[PDB]
Design an enzyme around this catalytic site. Structure first.
Site, PDB file in Angstrom:
ATOM      1  CG  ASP A 288      41.860  42.663  39.647  1.00  0.00           C
ATOM      2  OD1 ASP A 288      41.819  43.770  39.875  1.00  0.00           O
ATOM      3  OD2 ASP A 288      41.914  41.800  40.563  1.00  0.00           O
ATOM      4  CG  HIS A 385      35.476  48.320  35.839  1.00  0.00           C
ATOM      5  ND1 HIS A 385      36.623  47.437  36.473  1.00  0.00           N
ATOM      6  CD2 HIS A 385      36.504  49.481  35.441  1.00  0.00           C
ATOM      7  CE1 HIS A 385      37.775  48.140  36.502  1.00  0.00           C
ATOM      8  NE2 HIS A 385      37.643  49.216  35.744  1.00  0.00           N
ATOM      9  CG  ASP A 387      32.205  42.053  35.935  1.00  0.00           C
ATOM     10  OD1 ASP A 387      33.381  41.369  35.743  1.00  0.00           O
ATOM     11  OD2 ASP A 387      31.135  41.577  36.296  1.00  0.00           O
ATOM     12  CB  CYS A 541      38.260  41.054  44.131  1.00  0.00           C
ATOM     13  SG  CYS A 541      36.643  40.813  42.828  1.00  0.00           S
TER      14      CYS A 541
END
Lengths: 559, 559
Positions: A288, A385, A387, A541
């Site tokens: 990521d 983040h 997110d 993740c």
């Protein structure tokens, strides 16, 4: 059209070229009169007329390319008082010289500025993306063709040079198509002489950009064709006619969660493969830190990966791509954002302790101009983040998406409702009881402060993306200020989900269990399932996703 | 307006600030109803109404600044089925916080983007120009004022921070006015806490830019005021309300020959002082490498010199300022160029041998955006300056100027006319006779090639400045290709003149003398004197000129 002034003198005849498509004017006074000329020179004239005023305009246009030189002639008759005087003679050669590309972004080569829009004009160039000749490699590049019709004898006395400005040569590269391809313009050299034969010819070139737009490069590149007279041998060459195409380098464009998923990548667990299979998208196993976007030209689109048939850029934790999202297409007090609008997180004001994404990244996204980045506030989170506090999901109704935001409120309410109904004794995950959480006055005041932060962003995302409350949806979620009064999830962050096209891969909260079913897991579903979404929960993740690039053609935007 | 969302809960009352000028909305459903509130809270509400739908909008606006805190109150009444239930309580403090500057470019401090034009909005900043505190030095700078009205008790729980982005801090500097001035924002630090007292206060700041626009700086600078809650002591500060001004740095702007002369400078002859005295302009004696322009803000304009009460820039022979001119104001197929349009010379295409002005100079002029430079072709001249082939003079008629271009043609004609009339035996300046010049077939073909070059520029200057032939005027002038087939004047370049406002200081050609009067000297005058011009001739040029800056305000342009 645009172009030249020919002077005519009764001393000796004049010779000249006229390029088709240009406007050739004629200076008579510099020496009543009358004009007479070969059948293929249209001599329209305003205020024909007879006088000898210099405000008389005389324009010639040729109908077609000459066969020889002097094929067309023009006779100007000087007369008046009581005299015959002179006939001045003029011998024209007509050539056709078209530097031409795909200026209507329609895959087909057919006003010398690049204009955005559905009725704009400008060819488009792709930057060249490659980690570490004939048609085998030129499908990707942009075709440009010189076409000429000139009399067989023509290029003894004139030559053609193709050039770029010294200021753009490093940002472009042109290849010539002999009918081998070889570099003829580029970072090394800005001009090149063309070996073109007289008569009807046309040659192909292939252009590639070598630079996305950026603070030092708006992304326009101009290539010009000059036609020089080399007829007098001692004198240097004189330019007779320049003409050009303006190309625009295609920006790097990000793909939102609302775009159908094409492929998932993960590193060295088997719950994301079950997910991919219901999502209709492919799964490949080999991180990521890299974001998968695309570049697009009428002739080719090409996925390009933004690390720090796959292209590659590397410009250069708020300062990472997990701090990088895109809104879905949205419209904002009129102004339309077809490719979405990039969200990335920073602080409110800047400080000794503020973090931010690196300026060279921000700038690069802005220069990419077609997803006008918005700055959000994420510096309040330990990690940073955006997110951690938002996500986007497909809806089948109002706008066709929903902005999910994290909501500590929505969790308090949910746990409170539970207590009321009688389950204050239920275990979250220490393992604390659903009530001791409610009583906890230090938790409360933390999630209160987080609530302020998320709410600040609610209002930015309401403003900058034109959202209404009917677009947003609070997902129950708690936080805790640990490290530096910065925030972290009090239990797996559900709003940090893998939106795999209508099939959501959410982190399981091991939330308090009622009727043998986690209340959070359950409330989440009464929010999402009515929309058509299929929630699934996973344990944490290392996943990226390639999504289908927008149908909309970026160049039809109007930033 | 823009702004916040207050949530109301029957559990415990809420407290909040509302800044005057913002839009405070109210979340009722998150917990039929009715609304009731203190006299100074206008509670307008759409679809008052009674229902409990979340699509009910409720907005509060305060009429005035509070005196205390909780001065204004809001009571929300929950009711329905067959019950009394709760009254939720909300205690508002109203403050007034205005960061405000001169956003209407009118010397007077009174939508958070800078827009160009006569009905645009944006304050203007001057860059600071200085080779090598109170009002004694701040007349030049731009005044910005914070004004506040808040209850006396207010700033125990909130503070104000003024900031700039880390990306603009090096380009600006803000000074604070205690009623000493000290730096509070700048290249060192981006934020600063304000020590503002409760009640009615206002403080002055003084801003200066430190950077003209340029490829890496569009010239916008934003200063923001944030109001932070510091009421909870363990929690970090939360931002309640940001507001800002956007400033624009004033560009460096050049002054054409049509602008009334204010002062001439020359280095260590007495013909330019006679000239200055008829011109009405001042003369000071203490070099043509430096160009005198100006910067301008509603409050101050200031002459600034561009070397390589006087400002100073030094960014960095085609690559000199003698290769730098400006057109006079002109209008071009609609688009209006009030400050003229900068002309500077280069080649046609680029080559092993092409010269050009340095790219960093070109770029700097372009970024100055308000005189959209035009590239001319001057590389054909030994020296390279566009002044060798053009000049601008005031006219009293059509547009109020004339473009003079050099014209070898106009000299041939003039010498030819002389021969006819009988003076083929006349001496120019070797010393060659006016005829041997006409017969000279190598000269002829040289001036023929020069003619092509000047003509190429005629057509650019016709296009880019919207000129008609009635705007141009050929001055008789010969050239010779010597060094490298590059051109030089065959006799003193008349078109290289000192335009000292209607009083022209032209280089004397020692042209062939007729009736004891030089034919060129004489023809020049039959071209200029009818226009009102007063030609004078001098022998050879170390002169600059400061001209009156345009009335037109650059920011009222619309580039």
């Amino acid at each position: 059209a645009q172009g030249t002034l020919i002077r005519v003198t009764p001393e000796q005849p004049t010779h000249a070229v006229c390029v088709l498509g240009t406007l050739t004017q004629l200076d008579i006074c510099s020496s009543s009169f009358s004009i007479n000329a070969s059948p293929g020179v249209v001599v329209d004239i305003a205020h024909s007329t007879w006088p000898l005023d210099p405000g008389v305009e005389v324009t010639l246009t040729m109908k077609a390319a000459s066969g020889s030189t002097g094929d067309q002639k023009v006779q100007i008759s000087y007369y008046g008082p009581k005299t015959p005087p002179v006939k001045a003679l003029l011998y024209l050669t007509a050539v056709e010289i078209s530097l031409c590309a795909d200026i209507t972004r329609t895959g087909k080569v057919k006003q010398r500025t690049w204009t955005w829009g559905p009725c704009g004009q400008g060819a488009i160039l792709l930057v060249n993306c490659d980690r570490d000749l004939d048609s085998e490699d030129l499908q990707d590049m942009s075709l440009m063709t010189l076409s000429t019709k000139t009399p067989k004898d023509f290029f003894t006395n004139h030559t053609l040079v193709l050039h770029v400005a010294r200021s753009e040569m490093d940002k472009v590269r042109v290849f010539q198509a002999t009918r081998k391809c070889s570099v003829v313009l580029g970072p090394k050299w800005p001009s090149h002489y063309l070996m073109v034969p007289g008569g009807k010819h046309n040659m192909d070139f292939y252009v590639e950009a070598l630079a996305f737009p950026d603070t030092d490069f708006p992304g326009l590149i101009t290539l010009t064709i000059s036609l020089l007279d080399t007829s007098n041998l001692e004198l240097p060459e004189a330019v007779v006619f320049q003409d050009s195409v303006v190309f625009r380098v295609a920006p790097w464009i990000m793909t939102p969660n609302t775009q159908p998923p094409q492929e998932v990548y993960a590193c060295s667990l088997k719950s994301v493969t079950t997910l991919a299979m219901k999502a209709k998208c492919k799964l490949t196993i080999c991180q990521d830190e890299m974001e998968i976007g695309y570049i697009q030209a009428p002739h080719k689109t090409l996925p390009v990966v933004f690390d720090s048939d796959f292209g590659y850029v590397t410009r250069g934790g708020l300062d990472s791509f997990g701090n990088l999202e895109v809104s879905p297409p949205v419209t904002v007090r009129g102004k339309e954002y077809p490719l979405g609008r990039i969200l990335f997180g920073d602080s409110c004001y800047p400080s000794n302790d503020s973090r931010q994404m690196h300026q060279a990244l921000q700038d690069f996204l802005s220069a990419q101009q077609v997803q006008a980045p918005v700055k959000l506030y994420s510096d309040w989170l330990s990690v940073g983040h955006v997110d951690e506090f938002l996500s986007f999901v497909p809806a089948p109704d109002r706008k066709g998406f929903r902005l999910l935001l994290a909501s500590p409120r929505s969790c308090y309410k949910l746990f409170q409702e539970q207590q009321n109904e009688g389950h204050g004794e239920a275990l979250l995950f220490k393992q604390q009881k659903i009530k001791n959480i409610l009583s906890n006055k230090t938790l409360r005041e933390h999630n209160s402060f987080v609530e302020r932060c998320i709410d600040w962003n609610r209002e930015l995302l309401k403003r900058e993306l034109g959202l209404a409350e009917s677009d947003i949806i609070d997902i129950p979620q708690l936080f805790k200020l640990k490290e530096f009064s910065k925030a972290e999830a009090f239990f797996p962050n559900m709003v940090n989900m893998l939106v795999l096209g209508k099939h959501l891969g959410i982190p399981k909260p091991f939330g308090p269990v009622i009727n043998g079913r986690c209340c959070l897991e359950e409330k989440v579903c009464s929010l999402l399932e009515p929309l058509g979404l299929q929630c699934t929960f996973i344990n944490d993740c290392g996943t990226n996703v390639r999504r289908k690039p927008f149908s909309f053609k970026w160049w039809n935007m109007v930033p």
